[PDB]
Each structure stands twice: as structure tokens, then as C-alpha cells.
Amino acid sequence: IAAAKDPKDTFEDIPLDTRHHTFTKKISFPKEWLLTEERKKELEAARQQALLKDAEKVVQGALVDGADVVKQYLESGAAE
Amino acid sequence: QKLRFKKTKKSGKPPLPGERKAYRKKIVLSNNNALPVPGLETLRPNDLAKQDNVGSVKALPEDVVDALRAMEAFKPTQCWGIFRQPSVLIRQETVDLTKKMKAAGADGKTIRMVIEGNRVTGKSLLLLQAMTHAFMNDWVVLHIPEAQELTTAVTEYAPIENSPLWTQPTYTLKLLQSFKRANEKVLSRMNTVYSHADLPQIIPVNSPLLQLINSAKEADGAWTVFQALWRELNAENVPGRPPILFSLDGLAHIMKVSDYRNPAFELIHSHDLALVKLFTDCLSGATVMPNGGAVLGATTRGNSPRSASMELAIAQREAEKAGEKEVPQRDPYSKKYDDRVEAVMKSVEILRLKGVSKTEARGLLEYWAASGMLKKRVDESMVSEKWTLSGNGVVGEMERASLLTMKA
Amino acid sequence: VEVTPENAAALSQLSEIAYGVKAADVAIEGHKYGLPTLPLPSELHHKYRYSEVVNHATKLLMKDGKLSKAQRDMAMILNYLRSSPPPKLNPSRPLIPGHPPASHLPLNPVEYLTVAIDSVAPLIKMRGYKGLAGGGRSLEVPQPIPARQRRSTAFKWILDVVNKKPSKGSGRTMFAHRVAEEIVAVVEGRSSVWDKRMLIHKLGTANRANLNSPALQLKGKRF
RNA sequence: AAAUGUGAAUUUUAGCUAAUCUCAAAAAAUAGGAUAAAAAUAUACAAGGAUUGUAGUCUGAAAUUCGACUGCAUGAAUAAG
Ligand SMILES: Nc1ncnc2c1ncn2[C@@H]1O[C@H](COP(=O)(O)OP(=O)(O)OP(=O)(O)O)[C@@H](O)[C@H]1O
Ligand SMILES: [Mg+2]
Ligand SMILES: [Mg+2]
Ligand SMILES: [Mg+2]
Ligand SMILES: [Mg+2]
Ligand SMILES: [Mg+2]
Ligand SMILES: [Mg+2]
Ligand SMILES: [Mg+2]
Ligand SMILES: [Mg+2]
């Protein structure tokens, strides 16, 4: 304490060196995932938009299915 | 003498030079077995800038693939030879970067940007889309495929008289040869406007600019021809000079001390290499492009060293953009920083790449399924499965889980 | 005919329960989005997710417990077979009956591999009885072998032909592509493993009578 | 931890006599990258690290018979038996 009060050299030029210490970073559960009354409404929207997006394609016949695409191509005599 | 037993002592044509290296570096861009995707559109000159195309896959024109192939835009690690026609996913990051290139070249300004991301997120391919938008819109693309070929001391290098810089003739020659084929159409429309005294041949003013490039037949005078070419493309006030796209992949290699040794056996700094000294000046704003354009530097994670200066700079620029009153600062006791790397990165713009959205992931999966390479029912339940296994939509990881699997 | 939520599931035939729009009652039914239909397909068991032949052939590539490497090699093999042109079957080497036409193999690399292994796999094995054929000679007798023993012998022949071939290029695809090329040579009938299959079949036909040899039935019955 | 040395290591001790502090860093893997007529045609002699020269370090009265590591140079047999 006496050396710290010494106004001779304040060592303000020297930055605090913390290389001797190993800082640790802790992880926490995301607060955005907490199932609250507000998030439930958010999921209902996403759950419903998913149904519409697929429903639109099934009606238009645009839902891609790699299995049937390869089958029809091989059975349509298009592979020589 | 010794009486122990001893096994008494005692096919095909070997490969030619460069055959093995060319085997692991060849790029296949088609597959006759793959199915032709119905409704697959080709990129128009202004498709990489429309917001409506986000999440859609479109095919690259035929002439573009010849230019991109000329300057080694494709890479062996990328999955191109699994499908019939090279196609890319117009991505929200593509529209952002492209809309800036469009305004930059039109207003005569210059955007100096750096691309950053995780291991395989689309950094190298986001440039392929920037070069694609450049060729189609009649720009001058000057691309450096791998920045490690300029720093790892694997090519000839010679000093410049009365200067600390160093030239790389064998590389500059090969760079001009690929620069012609890619920009053959744009160069044919431009002629010289200056009198270049020192050249391998005499060249009068107002001559085909493509002739100036053909003067560099030997590696010796390769650099001299390059500097002359660089003066022409950057003519102050000359009608018909298009913007320039100076792109470099592997930014982390040119942000440290190179592996070259000077006569005193001291490591040469990467910014002293004449060719690297040119890109850093354009990226730092020191060398202005009168006609405008864009200077893009993409980092890499595969075979890339770590430069605290570049990582700190990237962190500071993202902090200033976000508006954080506190910005990351140097470690006051670390001795891994480089003052010159800080100056170059002091005003660049950052473009962080992360996983794609679940809407973009669908457009990419449907393209794989339509090609018969993903035998699954592409629906929300399947998109979310691949989107999760790919770590929130990392495009690179999404391919290993769908295309490079052993389940089909 | 514009679709909307109130009529999406009704017109698209999609189950709202499967999408979570109208979940079930957990307190009563116990589930929330429907029960998977049982029995489950074999591919949903985490220990049997891969095809029987692919999973069996993969671990034959493994060495020193490096299954991740062998799994990436098998992925490169199936990727090579998927980019190669359709094979040209040889009438002299008839593949296993019931196989699909050659035009279907490229897009189905798993069947390409399966048809190849199941085609050159022998049907019998030669077991020898010590000192029952004459002056110290053994009595060789053929016997059938199950599927796993047939595929194991076949794929090990393929790897034996692969290891002896010379190097071609560089990179991470050397071994993978070198094996895939041999898989194609087998389906085309121009491979060397076909000789080893016919060689072991000859021993079976040349010894089909030893199944009832006097030595095999008079071990200790001549006191 | 810091500083010094290409390195072995040195200078100096913060903490702990310990689920606290220290030895302490996992490696293979995963993902990229470089090298090929990668030894048999002598102007293309691969991989390999034994043998020996020399300059150092640490332990200890003491390193010669007879120790362990480090730098530079030297570069044997070895075609999977
Ligand atoms: N927009 C896209 N459309 C289609 N495929 C893409 C797209 N973006 C990336 N990919 C694919 O993702 C994989 C990785 O892409 P890319 O090589 O560009 O990543 P990277 O950021 O440059 O990686 P690295 O840091 O290792 O250099 C490639 O197979 C690539 O084809
Ligand atoms: Mg990259
Ligand atoms: Mg590897
Ligand atoms: Mg220490
Ligand atoms: Mg220890
Ligand atoms: Mg060899
Ligand atoms: Mg050697
Ligand atoms: Mg001694
Ligand atoms: Mg042995």
C-alpha cells in the first residue's frame, strides 16, 4: 500500500498484464428458447406456415420426391 | 564367418510429369448419368441482383463457365461433377454483394470488402458469383485463385532495382495468359492510350490492347507488361473503360511474413511482393481505381494460417458497423500483431457468411432431388432435418450429409 | 383455387397433427404428433442404418479401427460408380438373376455394388479332412456357405486385385477410385476375380463324389 | 506467468502440499494443402535414420572405460521377409 501511494511512478503507462490467469467462458441456455406464452404464438405461426408451403406445392404438383423422379426416368425408357 | 540365414537379393509405363498433380486438380462440371432438372433457368445478365431470385437455383451460361474455368474459379473440393449443368443458389448474401458491385461500377466508386465465415460456408463460391456478375456485365475480372502460391515460396521471384519490392515473373506470365482468355471479349473493345517505352516489343498508341498482352511471351518481361496493362485499364478519362474486379482468395496468406528469403536470409514480408503490394494498395484505398469497381478478399479455413492482425481488424470493423461504443483492441502484451496488416484493413468492409435460411435450403435440396442425387421426399420435415445436421444451414456441411453419403 | 389454412389440410390431404397445427392430447393419447407405424423399417435402427452389403463391405476396407476413413472411401466409391457410364454386360458372365438392367445401376450405386459382389461371390467352399485321401493327402469336400461368407470372400478378392495394381494419380481419391474401377470391371465381366470364382467352382465339381467317400464314413468303424 | 536461447535449457519464483494450485499439452481422427517416371534406362539414386565427426545442455565429487537429451554434418542395410 505504501508503494502504491508513492507518487514517484504511477505505472499508468504499463497496461495491466493478465497472462498469468486463464479466463473461463461459461455457456448458458438460450433465453430465446424458453417456452413462454409469447413464443407459443411464434411457433404456431411457423408450424402453420410450414403446412401452407407444402400444401401449395402438393396442389400444384411441385413437391419434389427424388425416389419417384429416378424411378419414372428409368421406366420411361429415357436412359437408353 | 556368419552362418545365419539371409534372404538373398531379388512393370508398367509410369505417368508423365504433371500427370499426377493434374489428376487431383482436374474439375469435372457435368455428369451424363444425372438427370436434367426441369424448369432450370439460366442466369441473365441481371439475375444475381434481383431480390426475388433469393432461394432459387439457376444455371451458369456456357461462355461464363469457359471464363470461370480459365481463371480457375472452380476448385476440386467443390461438388460440381455430381450434376449435369453447373448451377448456383442465388443467396441473400449474393444479392447484397451484387447490388453494391452494380452501384459501384455505375457511380464510378470502388467497394473494398472482405468475406469471412466458417470452414465451408460459401466464401470461395461467393466470389465465383461476383466474377459471374462481372463477366456477364462486361467488367474486367482479375482473379488470383490461390494466395498461398504467392507466399509459400513455390514460384520464381526476383528483386526490383532500387526498391524493397520483389517480382514473381513465372506467376505474372501465367496470370496474363489466363487474363486474356477470360476477358477476351472486353479487351477486344479497348485500345492503348499511353506510350509505353520499355516493353518486349514496340507498341504504338491507339493499338489493340489485346496485342499489348501478347508481348509477354517470356517470364522476364512479364511484370513490365502487367504494369503497363494496369495503367491502361485505369485510364483516368477514357470512354469505354469498364470497372475492374480485383479479387483474391485466401486473404490470410498475404497478411503475414512470407516464406521467401532475401540475400541476407531474412523473411520477406508478403506486402513487399510487387503483385501482393498491388492488391493490398487497392484494398486499402491507397491506389484508386478511376473507373471504379470492387476489390474483394475472401478468407479461407482449409490450409490457412492465423494472423491476429487480420482477425482483430475484421473484429473491429464489425464492431464499428454494429455501433458498439467499445471496439476490440490489441492485446497490450501480444507480439503476434503486424502494423502494416492493420493499416490495410483499416477501412475495408466485412461480409460474414453463415448458414443459409430454411427457405434457401429447400431450393438447394429440390435441385439435388430433381437431379436424382437425393432420393427423398423434399418437404419441411426433410428440409429441417438437413438444415439441422448441417449446423444451422452451413451449405458445405449440407452437401456431406446429402450428396457424399453412403446411404444412396 | 387459392389455398388457405382453413382448407389447406382438407385440400392437400396433409395431416395437421403431423405438422403440429392441431396437435393431439398428450394427457389422453400419450403422443402429440402421431405415433410411428410399427414395425419400423430396418433402416431406422441406428445400428442398421446402412445397407447390409454396404455396411459389410465398408468394414472390410477398415484398418486399425479407422471406420470414418473407410466410410468416406465407400462414399467415394458410390460417387464414382454414380458418375461412370452404364456398364456393358458380357453374356459370358451372367450376373445374378433378377438384377436390374445395366441402365439402372449408375443412378443406384448401392445396387451397382450389390449386383457386383453377389455376382462374383462363390456358392461353395472347400474343406479338407486331414489324412483321408491316401498317402498323407487330404480329402477335399465342397460345402455351401451363407450370404455373409459369400460376400466376404467376393469383396476380399476385389481388394486383393486392387492392392496389387500400380498407383495412378494423387489426392484422397486414389484408393477409392481404384476400387470403384474394379467394381465396374466385375460387372462388365472383364475382371480377374471371375477366374478365381470359376477356379473354386471346378474343385467343387471335380470333388462332388467325395461327399460319400469310404474314408469319410469309415473313421473308426474298421477295428 | 514473464524474460533469454535455433534447441536441449537457463534466469526468477506466483500458487499448491492439492476435486482448490502445478505437472498439463491428448494423439489418432475430422477438414484442407504440398510433393511423383516418389529406387530397377545412372544427367531422374525413393523412403529410411544405423554408423561416425563436431559444438553444447542437464544430473552428479566424478560422464574416460561407462549416462540421458540438443544443434550441425555424416547418410549404412532395408523391395514386406
Ligand atoms: N451458393 C451455392 N450454391 C451451391 N453450392 C454452394 C453454394 N455455396 C457454397 N456451395 C458449396 O458449398 C461447399 C463449400 O463452398 P466453398 O468452397 O465456397 O466454401 P469456403 O468458405 O470457400 O471454404 P474454405 O474456408 O475451406 O476455403 C462447396 O461444395 C460449394 O459448392
Ligand atoms: Mg475458400
Ligand atoms: Mg487427410
Ligand atoms: Mg513457462
Ligand atoms: Mg508429463
Ligand atoms: Mg515406389
Ligand atoms: Mg532421403
Ligand atoms: Mg560418454
Ligand atoms: Mg514379418
PDB file of N, CA and C in Angstrom, chain C residues 71-99:
ATOM      1  N   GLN C  71     -15.537 -45.213 -44.237  1.00  0.00           N
ATOM      2  CA  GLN C  71     -16.862 -44.726 -44.599  1.00  0.00           C
ATOM      3  C   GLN C  71     -16.786 -43.650 -45.671  1.00  0.00           C
ATOM      4  N   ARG C  72     -15.746 -42.814 -45.642  1.00  0.00           N
ATOM      5  CA  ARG C  72     -15.584 -41.820 -46.695  1.00  0.00           C
ATOM      6  C   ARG C  72     -15.117 -42.461 -47.994  1.00  0.00           C
ATOM      7  N   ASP C  73     -14.312 -43.522 -47.908  1.00  0.00           N
ATOM      8  CA  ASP C  73     -13.920 -44.248 -49.111  1.00  0.00           C
ATOM      9  C   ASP C  73     -15.135 -44.868 -49.787  1.00  0.00           C
ATOM     10  N   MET C  74     -15.966 -45.572 -49.015  1.00  0.00           N
ATOM     11  CA  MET C  74     -17.185 -46.137 -49.580  1.00  0.00           C
ATOM     12  C   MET C  74     -18.073 -45.053 -50.173  1.00  0.00           C
ATOM     13  N   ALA C  75     -18.053 -43.850 -49.595  1.00  0.00           N
ATOM     14  CA  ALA C  75     -18.805 -42.746 -50.178  1.00  0.00           C
ATOM     15  C   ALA C  75     -18.201 -42.299 -51.501  1.00  0.00           C
ATOM     16  N   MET C  76     -16.874 -42.361 -51.626  1.00  0.00           N
ATOM     17  CA  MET C  76     -16.231 -42.011 -52.887  1.00  0.00           C
ATOM     18  C   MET C  76     -16.461 -43.089 -53.937  1.00  0.00           C
ATOM     19  N   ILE C  77     -16.498 -44.354 -53.519  1.00  0.00           N
ATOM     20  CA  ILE C  77     -16.771 -45.437 -54.460  1.00  0.00           C
ATOM     21  C   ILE C  77     -18.169 -45.283 -55.043  1.00  0.00           C
ATOM     22  N   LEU C  78     -19.166 -45.084 -54.179  1.00  0.00           N
ATOM     23  CA  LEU C  78     -20.530 -44.906 -54.665  1.00  0.00           C
ATOM     24  C   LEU C  78     -20.667 -43.630 -55.485  1.00  0.00           C
ATOM     25  N   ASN C  79     -19.807 -42.641 -55.242  1.00  0.00           N
ATOM     26  CA  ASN C  79     -19.830 -41.425 -56.043  1.00  0.00           C
ATOM     27  C   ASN C  79     -19.171 -41.640 -57.398  1.00  0.00           C
ATOM     28  N   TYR C  80     -18.131 -42.473 -57.452  1.00  0.00           N
ATOM     29  CA  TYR C  80     -17.504 -42.805 -58.726  1.00  0.00           C
ATOM     30  C   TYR C  80     -18.446 -43.630 -59.594  1.00  0.00           C
ATOM     31  N   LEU C  81     -19.036 -44.682 -59.021  1.00  0.00           N
ATOM     32  CA  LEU C  81     -19.974 -45.505 -59.776  1.00  0.00           C
ATOM     33  C   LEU C  81     -21.148 -44.685 -60.287  1.00  0.00           C
ATOM     34  N   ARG C  82     -21.511 -43.620 -59.577  1.00  0.00           N
ATOM     35  CA  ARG C  82     -22.647 -42.799 -59.968  1.00  0.00           C
ATOM     36  C   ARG C  82     -22.310 -41.831 -61.093  1.00  0.00           C
ATOM     37  N   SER C  83     -21.025 -41.610 -61.367  1.00  0.00           N
ATOM     38  CA  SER C  83     -20.588 -40.720 -62.432  1.00  0.00           C
ATOM     39  C   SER C  83     -20.005 -41.466 -63.623  1.00  0.00           C
ATOM     40  N   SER C  84     -19.894 -42.787 -63.547  1.00  0.00           N
ATOM     41  CA  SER C  84     -19.348 -43.578 -64.638  1.00  0.00           C
ATOM     42  C   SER C  84     -20.445 -43.943 -65.633  1.00  0.00           C
ATOM     43  N   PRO C  85     -20.095 -44.201 -66.890  1.00  0.00           N
ATOM     44  CA  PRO C  85     -21.110 -44.566 -67.881  1.00  0.00           C
ATOM     45  C   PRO C  85     -21.693 -45.934 -67.582  1.00  0.00           C
ATOM     46  N   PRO C  86     -22.904 -46.218 -68.054  1.00  0.00           N
ATOM     47  CA  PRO C  86     -23.516 -47.523 -67.789  1.00  0.00           C
ATOM     48  C   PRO C  86     -22.632 -48.650 -68.289  1.00  0.00           C
ATOM     49  N   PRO C  87     -22.549 -49.756 -67.554  1.00  0.00           N
ATOM     50  CA  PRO C  87     -21.680 -50.858 -67.977  1.00  0.00           C
ATOM     51  C   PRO C  87     -22.280 -51.625 -69.145  1.00  0.00           C
ATOM     52  N   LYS C  88     -21.438 -52.451 -69.757  1.00  0.00           N
ATOM     53  CA  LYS C  88     -21.821 -53.300 -70.883  1.00  0.00           C
ATOM     54  C   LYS C  88     -21.705 -54.749 -70.425  1.00  0.00           C
ATOM     55  N   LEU C  89     -22.837 -55.341 -70.055  1.00  0.00           N
ATOM     56  CA  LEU C  89     -22.834 -56.706 -69.550  1.00  0.00           C
ATOM     57  C   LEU C  89     -22.296 -57.666 -70.603  1.00  0.00           C
ATOM     58  N   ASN C  90     -21.560 -58.677 -70.142  1.00  0.00           N
ATOM     59  CA  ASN C  90     -20.987 -59.681 -71.024  1.00  0.00           C
ATOM     60  C   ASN C  90     -21.820 -60.949 -70.946  1.00  0.00           C
ATOM     61  N   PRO C  91     -22.397 -61.434 -72.051  1.00  0.00           N
ATOM     62  CA  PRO C  91     -23.210 -62.658 -71.962  1.00  0.00           C
ATOM     63  C   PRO C  91     -22.457 -63.846 -71.394  1.00  0.00           C
ATOM     64  N   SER C  92     -21.129 -63.873 -71.525  1.00  0.00           N
ATOM     65  CA  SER C  92     -20.360 -64.986 -70.979  1.00  0.00           C
ATOM     66  C   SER C  92     -20.374 -64.982 -69.457  1.00  0.00           C
ATOM     67  N   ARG C  93     -20.498 -63.808 -68.842  1.00  0.00           N
ATOM     68  CA  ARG C  93     -20.521 -63.687 -67.391  1.00  0.00           C
ATOM     69  C   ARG C  93     -21.911 -63.259 -66.939  1.00  0.00           C
ATOM     70  N   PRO C  94     -22.882 -64.170 -66.902  1.00  0.00           N
ATOM     71  CA  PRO C  94     -24.238 -63.779 -66.492  1.00  0.00           C
ATOM     72  C   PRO C  94     -24.273 -63.383 -65.024  1.00  0.00           C
ATOM     73  N   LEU C  95     -24.797 -62.190 -64.758  1.00  0.00           N
ATOM     74  CA  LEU C  95     -24.900 -61.703 -63.393  1.00  0.00           C
ATOM     75  C   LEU C  95     -25.965 -62.492 -62.635  1.00  0.00           C
ATOM     76  N   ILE C  96     -26.130 -62.154 -61.359  1.00  0.00           N
ATOM     77  CA  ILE C  96     -27.113 -62.863 -60.535  1.00  0.00           C
ATOM     78  C   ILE C  96     -28.502 -62.641 -61.120  1.00  0.00           C
ATOM     79  N   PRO C  97     -29.352 -63.663 -61.218  1.00  0.00           N
ATOM     80  CA  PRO C  97     -30.678 -63.452 -61.809  1.00  0.00           C
ATOM     81  C   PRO C  97     -31.509 -62.481 -60.985  1.00  0.00           C
ATOM     82  N   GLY C  98     -32.382 -61.752 -61.676  1.00  0.00           N
ATOM     83  CA  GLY C  98     -33.232 -60.767 -61.043  1.00  0.00           C
ATOM     84  C   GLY C  98     -32.636 -59.381 -60.941  1.00  0.00           C
ATOM     85  N   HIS C  99     -31.388 -59.195 -61.363  1.00  0.00           N
ATOM     86  CA  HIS C  99     -30.757 -57.892 -61.281  1.00  0.00           C
ATOM     87  C   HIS C  99     -31.439 -56.914 -62.233  1.00  0.00           C
TER      88      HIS C  99
END
